[PDB]
Design an enzyme around this catalytic site. Sequence first.
Site: not given
Lengths: 107, 872
Positions: A26, A36-37, A56, A99
């Site tokens: 991802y 952020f990721d 999550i 995402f």
Amino acid sequence: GVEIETISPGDGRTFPKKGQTCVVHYTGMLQNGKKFDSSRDRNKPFKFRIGKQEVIKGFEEGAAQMSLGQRAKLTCTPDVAYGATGHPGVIPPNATLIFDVELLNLE
Amino acid sequence: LLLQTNLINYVTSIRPNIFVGRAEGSTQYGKWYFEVMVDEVVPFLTAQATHLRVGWALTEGYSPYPGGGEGWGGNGVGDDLYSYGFDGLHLWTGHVARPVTSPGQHLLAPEDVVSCCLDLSVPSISFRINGCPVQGVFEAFNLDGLFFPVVSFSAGVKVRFLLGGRHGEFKFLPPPGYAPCHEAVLPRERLRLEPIKEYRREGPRPHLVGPSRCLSHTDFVPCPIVLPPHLERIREKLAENIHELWALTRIEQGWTYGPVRDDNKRLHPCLVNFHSLPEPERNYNLQMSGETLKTLLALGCHVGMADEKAEDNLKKTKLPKTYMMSNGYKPAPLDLSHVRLTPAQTTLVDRLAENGHNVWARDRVAQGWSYSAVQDIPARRNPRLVPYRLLDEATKRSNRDSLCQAVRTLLGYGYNIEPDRVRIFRAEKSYTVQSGRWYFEFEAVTTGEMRVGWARPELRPDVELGADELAYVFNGHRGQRWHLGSEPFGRPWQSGDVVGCMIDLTENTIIFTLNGEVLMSDSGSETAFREIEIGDGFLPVCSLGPGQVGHLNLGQDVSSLRFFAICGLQEGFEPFAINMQRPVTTWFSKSLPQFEPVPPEHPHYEVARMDGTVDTPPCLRLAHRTWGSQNSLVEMLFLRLSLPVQFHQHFRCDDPEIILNTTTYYYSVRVFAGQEPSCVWVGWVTPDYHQHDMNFDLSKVRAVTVTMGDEQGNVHSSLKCSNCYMVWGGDFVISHTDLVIGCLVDLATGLMTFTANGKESNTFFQVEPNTKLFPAVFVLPTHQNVIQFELGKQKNIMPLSAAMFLSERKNPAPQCPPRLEVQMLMPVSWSRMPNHFLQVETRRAGERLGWAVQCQDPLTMMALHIPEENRC
């Protein structure tokens, strides 16, 4: 509410079931466009077990609806992922998470 | 608040030489079609996805630079209002993505055919993927410019182009009324694949190029008395002369006298004489003779009538036995062998032939004809329907030899006839020298306006290179040096010579050497500039004019220097990069204007942040320092504040209770006495605004209207994307009272209304949910006191300082922090060339596959994001 919008087509017959691992390469973003990721800057794919509450709630209800080799785009609402206090230092409180998940192998 | 870092990919852009335009007189069709077929795309070569979109753009705005740009980075098609991208499921324009509802929505997978439809008669740009149309089109766009196909690809993308039937094979047949894109190529050019706005071109010995001179909007349009009785009688004598000259060449190649007219049988009906021609042939000659003397005294050449006896003494030309045709009758044209044409008449015979075809191009455009590469008579297309400077030399010489016949016989009858911007390529400021002797070279591939020499590191790009005291430069087109003026020096350049520049900081002398020969001035001095101060140091500078090409070999390798050992080694001079392990980075000038704050010591404009009294809120003013004489500069300046406002991501869909729960903000400006309100434009500017023109109006504003519907044909939504959301001050009002233009924003509904002097007006604007807006006022100064930004609060609405800062969201008092300053848009700025460019492979492979293009080199870079201006 998880809005799954597809980006590239996949197989369409192999879907993840309970107690089964998945590998997902991802890269997550916010609503504003700030990343952020990412799991491709590390060159190490994220692997998680479905149903054992590792990720999550928006991530697993997002990964369960896809097929093998499919790449989709989720828009996780702030109610289902880090509602009130959030994750300190990364995500601000009451922020929408986006995402771009891609399932590489094994359902 | 803080600077962000991310690794971003590099992208390019390639075009063919197919420019499409519309004007009042449009000589092209206006609706075209082309296809693009992908065959190989790597999904993820690096950590970021491979950016690949397809569409159109315009000439003057779409300037994709390899380093830096709007957004986070990697700007290509779709990242401005100038270009229109399509990746398969997003409609990219103005750096905002619009997701579509297309059957089988996905990215541009391999073995896919993406098509782009275009129409300029009414604005509509359609896209169809693999023979199925998408439900999203672009309308209401601006047509000030020319359109051309652009693709933008990241690393690891091979893609083929399908422009026309002669260059490729259309896998899908075009809709009725859309011509293939291969017909709009000009006759003076073959179809090439070239980049846009380049500055680095790889060569055999990397060459630096200048800005290309692209075609203007009103360049494709063609541009257009009584007659005295002394020249009215000669119109029949010239008309019989041209008919005698037409019958002489026609019998020479094979036409004969006949009653019927046939081209294949070589039959000429008017081959006997001018009187033997029929009446529609005769009056056609006299109106054409009546036209060509009508434009003769229309340019301004004076004619007189004299030497009538010498004209009557002139006989006809000699005609032999082979010169008379098969009928037995020959024309007898006037001999012009005694009269020779001068270059003053050679320039006029080009100007009469230019006026003859432009009046032919306008009349054919008034009938309803157009231009294509193919010649289709029932389709109203003819290949010579371009203006005279864009016409090929075969047709240009053909009408000049036909009109050279009519001039020299009128001269034989005794009638006498009386007669973007500039780029600057400099090195980095960390390589500035302070001592020693240094040498570099410059090769000149194409001669013209190029200026090479040495400059100090505090060089400004707004000034012309050589007109200030910050550089010692040598111009080679007319052979003169440029430092605080001009003085002649040396010899002019040629095409293929090297210009060696040496500096010597020990004696403070500069010597210019052209091809090893040390250039001298008129007095005999070999040194060019004397007694120069060191100060901050020197660095090599290079300027190239429009369209010029030449590489700057700074001397990193000793063997790469051509004329080092001939002159400049035994005198003691050393090359610049004699011991450097990496190549020297060059800093080049941009033509894309960017916002930056006003300097405090500026001679014309200054600002003053006035404090807030009990009556007037805290406000700031601009006042012209030098309004009267003594070098006053009055041009339209564009001022913007430093912080934007940010709308809320989800839309909504006095008393202390109504002020703490409201989301609406106000700011006003007060226009002073003596300042005319016609030159005042007040409103908001979204950050990708890089237009700096001195003739600015609200009609010259980029607007894109996107309408996306269902498959049945009914629309679902309509969004208008613009960068400049302002109003004209002349529509509201020696005025002795002051005009207050106010602006109202609601961050919850996204609705903007403009008020003037406490009265609401008819205008309204709606924005995207995620956008930022800068409060700007565009004004031309016609007084000493120009404008005044007043950040005041009204009865029940909070001032602008609450929307821009998070600490004062709930404080309704107006504040003016020093982070709020005003900006101004300078036209040029300094950026840096990257050291590794994307290597593109352009090659035509077959007549049906099309022009293939590919790159495989992976390239990444790190960049700052700077979120308050959204500029990288």
